[model samples]
Target: KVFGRCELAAAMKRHGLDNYRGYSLGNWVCAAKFESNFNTQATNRNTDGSTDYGILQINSRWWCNDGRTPGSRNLCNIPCSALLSSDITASVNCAKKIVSDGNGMNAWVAWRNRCKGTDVQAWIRGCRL
Candidate 1:
């Protein structure tokens, strides 16, 4: 499912993404904007042969088990398909694990380059939270 900007934001906030690991909901919104454009089933294949999955683009390298990532660690202990669900529970849980592992929001290049050190309030402005 492709979610609207505030729709995705509201979902993430409901799942406790707001203020997670010192990152605001706007930061995550900005990351999702550039990561998968809020598409729950989005997948991005990297040059290294690892595929990023779902709305937050959880990677197969060290997170989800894709059964084909070459050396997937499956640190999140979840199948890659779980990330593709529009329900987003699995994706959100894995994302929390990623940040708790000390990677922070910078784990996503989209967040690093686009959302970092910026006024991300615009990303959530006018959203009826």
Candidate 2:
């Protein structure tokens, strides 16, 4: 688990979350928290038999490999195992592409359910930018 939320926020900011593709850093951090509790090794099985991987919970069917076989879309062009790591660059890059593809943070259900329209200053509260 993350020692503090601000650390995650700051790291995300450094990775270009400050205002990339019109998404706020807080939304990124907020969605991460709800999706994986900031666990880099997180993985979840979907009802459709697909899966979500890593901090951003990107889907296997589109963003990464689905294990049994390669997914159809495979937009990220990386292994799902690559995302479940301490180095989050691949996942961050994947997220950037997802947003650039025209779906904003609304691509994440966690963002839709927990972060949209919320004032998330608390996410980076007390962290020096």
Candidate 3:
């Protein structure tokens, strides 16, 4: 969506995503790779009927509303489709809000399960960022 992994890292750095909300750059990259492989058009339906949208796989259950799911919290006050674009500004903003809610990267299960204490740096391997 954005570019190669290095360019993704560059964009992340330019946006100061490297240390936003106290989450590490590597952790964010790792989570993004696992959640959506940096693809903005990604979506996943959770087992609980909630849908994860976009590069961050943010849940509709407590994040955005797609006008189909009922009882969604819509914490980001955005439509789920708003994140399915190459422009990730909304997605990044939403993620910042999610982390600011005292969740950090814990807002993303993929982070906890795969990146908590593992080789976070490996996500950017071969990237020249």
Candidate 4:
């Protein structure tokens, strides 16, 4: 499922990503835009043979168990396929775990490049908090 900008913003906020770990909701919105364009089924294969999944693009290398990533830790204790679902509960929970694990939003390169150190408030401007 693809989400509109405000739809995704509200969803992430409801999932408690608003100022989660010092990263604002706008930062989360911006990262999702750059990562998967708010498409729930998005997936990307990395050069390391790992894969990223879902709207937030949680990686299989450490977060989810794809059963393919070599020696994956499955830190989120979820099947990678779960991240592709439209429900988003698994994906959001896994994302929170990533942040709480000390990686913060930097775990996502797209967040680092496009969402970090920017006026991310623009990403969530029209969304009613």
Worst 10 residues of 1 by lDDT: 99-108
Clashes of 4: 0
* lDDT by candidate, in order shown: 0.92, 0.82, 0.82, 0.91
By summed lDDT, the worst window of 10 consecutive residues in model 3 runs over 2-11
Q: Which numbered prediction scores highest in TM-score against the true structure?
A: 1
Q: What's the TM for model 2?
A: 0.92
TM-score of each: 0.96, 0.92, 0.89, 0.95
Itemize residue pairs with steric clashes in candidate 3.
Answer: none
Candidate 4 is scored at a TM of 0.95
lDDT of 4 by residue, 9-126 (tens): 9999898899888988999889999999999999999999999999999999899999999988898899999999988889999998888877788888999988889999999997
Q: Write the per-residue lDDT of candidate 1 for residues 86-129, one digit (tens) a residue.
A: 89889999999988887799898999999999999899999987
Candidate with the larger lDDT of 1 and 2: 1
Error of 1 at 123 (Å): 0.9
Per-residue CA lDDT of candidate 3, range 1-129, in tens?
745667667667666687887776788788888889888889998777889998889889888988767777998999999989888778888988888887678878988998899988776678766
Give me the displacement of residue 36 in model 2, in angstroms.
0.6
Candidate 4 — which residues are off by over 4 angstroms? none
Native-to-model Cα distance after best TM-score fit, residue 101 in candidate 3, in Å:
1.4
Q: Which pairs of residues have clashing backbones in candidate 2?
A: none
lDDT of 1 at 63: 96
Q: Runs in model 1 with CA error above 4 Å?
A: none
